[PDB]
Subunit: 307 residues, 2 copies
């Protein structure tokens, strides 16, 4: 007679810059007590819509996704945030589970794969002569998507919890930089995308995204960024950001998704990782944890309430 009722939301087996379909989630959640509606078009595509079963107090935990690895270190992991919220029966919650940023290696392109296995030194040769990489661009990991849980109020999205994604590692990342994690709780702070340079910044909560390599913001559908033009033209080395706003890689790493997306570097410096995104807890809820790093590649959401 355990009174705990628990729902675990996953990516439904989806990966990469785009979220799951209704069919994928039905298969993933078959025979469980979890049923979602997955939008098919517009900015709600791949977002899982869940009907609150009873007026009660719920705990809502989110884990963002990890960033991708570079062509040469530990990936930057997503973070988790948990909050307590009072919901009313028949309320609709909107859940976006972040997906991992793409890794640079391995590759089905034989030339790129020789870079990956350490037999092709063309990038190291270019680096010996330049501050950035300009010709042989690529090899930075994509940013991870953030995980978002939100509701509608009078037709307006209201964020409840956002757990940021990790930034992608640069091609030639060799040390960790130990930048502190940020957690926001003031809805008057602008929830915008991070800086894009050669790699894409992470997507925020509500922005206008125009660049192909930038991660899109949540209210635009949170698609992961493409890679920089030169990586594509030279050898097709594309390292996309993850669904949930991850920025695409160049030789530098893409930014992670969040309430505010992580910044990417201004130039294509092969030692510059993307920054992790910024997490968020609504003042409507009670914060129960700081934003803590979590091991797994893709994100997840855990919801619970007690009979």
């Amino acid at each position: 007679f355990d009174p705990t009722v628990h729902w675990l939301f996953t990516t439904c087996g989806a990966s990469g810059p785009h979220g799951p379909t209704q069919a994928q989630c039905n298969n993933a959640y078959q025979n469980s007590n979890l049923s979602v509606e997955v939008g098919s078009e517009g900015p709600l595509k791949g977002i899982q819509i869940w009907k609150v079963p009873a007026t009660d107090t719920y705990s809502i935990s989110g884990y963002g996704a990890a960033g991708g690895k570079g062509g040469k270190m530990m990936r930057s992991h997503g973070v988790s945030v948990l909050g307590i919220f009072n919901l009313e029966k028949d309320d609709m919650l909107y859940i976006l589970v972040g997906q991992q940023g793409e890794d640079a290696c391995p590759s089905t392109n034989q030339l790129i794969q020789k870079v990956c296995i350490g037999e092709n030194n063309v990038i190291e040769e270019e680096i010996r002569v330049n501050r950035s990489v300009h010709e042989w661009a690529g090899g930075g990991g994509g940013g991870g998507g953030a995980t978002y849980v939100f509701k509608m109020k009078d037709g307006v999205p209201v964020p409840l919890i956002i757990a940021a994604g990790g930034g992608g590692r640069a091609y030639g990342a060799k040390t960790d930089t130990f930048h502190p994690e940020r957690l926001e709780n003031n809805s008057s702070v602008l929830g915008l995308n991070g800086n894009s340079g050669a790699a894409g910044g992470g997507g925020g909560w509500n922005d206008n995204t125009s660049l192909l390599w930038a991660g899109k913001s949540l209210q635009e559908g949170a698609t992961g960024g493409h890679s920089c033009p030169q990586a594509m033209k030279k050898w097709g080395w594309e390292t996309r950001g993850g669904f949930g706003g991850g920025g695409g890689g160049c030789s530098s790493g893409g930014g992670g998704g969040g309430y505010i997306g992580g910044n990417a570097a201004s130039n294509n410096d092969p030692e510059m990782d993307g920054e992790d995104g910024v997490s968020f807890i609504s003042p409507l809820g009670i914060l129960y944890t700081p934003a803590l790093k979590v091991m797994e590649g893709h994100g997840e959401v855990n919801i619970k309430h007690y009979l």
Copy 2:
């Protein structure tokens, strides 16, 4: 995915757990500790580092006690998360802060009528006398801080200290973080309620929270509250100050101040937290913890 979660082992109040309490609490877990049985290390959990690695050490201090109105939420303890390089077989010393005691409810029928609002003896004293001297009590105790430290050449060296919350006054602030050990980790001011204990001080007053190096016992309540009607509201283990009508201060690296007089509207202040320059601060200190404290240690993840 492995981690080590230290709790109060089921202990509450001004005194830390026994070895038997931690053995019971940690049974069937991956955690084994030695708990001091006497001296300034009593109630402090000693843990051997299993492997040379970089670790994250997350400390959470305990919340303060409530006062005479349960609508007034308690002041939550502070979280402090750091990254540290540890060597196999190093010994860490872990004091998990305990919640400050609540004034209410009470087993005493007279005190319980005050708690429910059916006895106005304190309110009448406040009107007639403009201050509480006779019917003292009703303020919550301060919460204990959580302390993680090591010994170096026989001297304690602080790594992470996560402050406790001040107690609410009978008739009822940003997180502060220090990282320079030349700013001395002293107790907070005691008035009628006790100040929180700090890292290293000499505690004289019965109602003051003790400093960490004195054993971190929670303060007694103010003597008049004990004498008049036995309204004892003690600080939590980890340096919480005892309550009077005002609230006790929370433990910390520097203890939280209590008010100068027995003002029934004055909460105790939270303690000051600390992180050593031996570590890296992972995220800003943030008040989060509504009950007892805790410590979570795990292998570092980038």
